[PDB]
Each structure stands twice: as C-alpha cells, then as structure tokens.
C-alpha cells in the first residue's frame, strides 16, 4: 500500500483509524497514529492486507503510537485531500490563531484554526494532557489522522472531539467544536523517528 496521511487502516480486523504521517527510524518504515487506536503488536491492515504492527503506544496520559511497516510499503510525503494531496514539508509548530486542516477516513479533509494549546481531555479511560484544540470538525474513525497547515507543516495526530449523536461535530458551528490533536514533536523525539518530506 501507499502510505498517505489521512487514509483508513484497520486494527486487528475490528476498529478503524486514519494514518497520520509516514516516518522512518533508521531502515524501518512506519507511520505515526493515535495511541488509543491499538495496543502494541496489534495488526494493522490497509485494504484487507497486512501492512505492519503497533510498535509502541502511550494512551491515556498522552495519545500517540507508531506502526512499523513491512518494507513492501511505500512511504509518501503526502496527506490526502480528496483526490489531491498536501505535501509534507516539515513540522514547524503553528501558533494559536493559525489556520489548520486535518484529514481522516470519516469526514475527509476539514479546516479550521487552532484555538488553544495544553488542553486536558477526560476520556472514559483517563485523562490525556497537553493536547492542542482546533475547531476543524471530525468524526468517529478520524483518530490518528493528520493535522497539517496548507503550507505543509505537520502539527499532530487526531485524538478526540466533542462528538454529537451523528458521530461527528460537523453539524454544530465552529465556535462549539473542540477537536483535539496530539502534538507531533514529542512523538518524533520519543521514538527517534524522522518525518518523510517532499
């Protein structure tokens, strides 16, 4: 499979999440995703085919994971936006007020702005701290997906949101959305990963 940020992958033939970003760790290929998506050694599939396994994760507390891929996989410096792509150029952290988009398998590519940093989410499992909040909307299944600026700077991976009964927060005004993502920089240094860019 071609590994592009935003695309669907399954975990142990049951939950779905979205790919965050292609990365490497020496000769190993992988992608970063959300911690709550799978446990260590869970099998990841893209399109019915095994692409890799969860190599490490931290959830709750933080919400981060990276999946190590087999070498057959093609890592690409790209995030899906409909039939188009946004090139990943780097990982400069954007400030509050900055515009940002996110990509996932449930709501596709959505944009909004960053509204606050260092938010705590109190999920059923425990708190996750240090999250950035944006008001771009998202839905169940978008976990793990890319948050990136149009400029191509990788911000983080989708963690959670104030979901409504329709499975997303896209039908409430931007003002009432709390879409939270895990920052990329701590995940990259914690696992010693380098982002694939183009």
């Amino acid at each position: 499979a071609n590994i592009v940020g935003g695309i669907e992958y399954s975990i142990n033939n049951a939950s779905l999440c979205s790919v965050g970003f292609s990365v490497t760790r020496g000769a190993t290929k992988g992608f970063v995703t959300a911690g709550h998506c799978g446990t260590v050694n869970a099998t990841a599939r893209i399109g019915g085919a095994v692409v890799g396994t969860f190599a490490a994760r931290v959830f709750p507390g933080n919400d981060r994971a990276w999946v190590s891929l087999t070498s057959a996989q093609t890592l690409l410096p790209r995030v899906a936006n409909g039939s188009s792509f946004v090139t990943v150029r780097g990982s400069t952290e954007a400030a509050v007020g900055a515009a940002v988009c996110r990509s996932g398998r449930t709501t596709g590519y959505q944009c909004g702005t960053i509204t606050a940093k260092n938010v705590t989410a109190n999920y059923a499992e425990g708190a996750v701290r240090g999250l950035t909040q944006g008001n771009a909307c998202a839905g169940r299944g978008d976990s793990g997906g890319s948050w990136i600026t149009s400029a191509g700077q990788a911000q983080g991976v989708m963690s959670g949101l104030n979901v409504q009964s329709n499975g997303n927060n896209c039908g409430i005004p931007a003002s009432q959305r709390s879409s939270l993502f895990e920052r990329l920089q701590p995940i990259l240094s914690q696992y010693g990963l380098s982002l694939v860019t183009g």
């Binding site: 959300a34 709550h36 919400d63 109190n122 978008d142 989708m158 959670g160 979901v163 709390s178």
Partner: peptide, 4 residues
C-alpha cells in the same frame, strides 16, 4: 470529549 471522546477518542476518535
């Protein structure tokens, strides 16, 4: 807010 819930995971995702």
């Amino acid at each position: 807010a819930a995971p995702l």
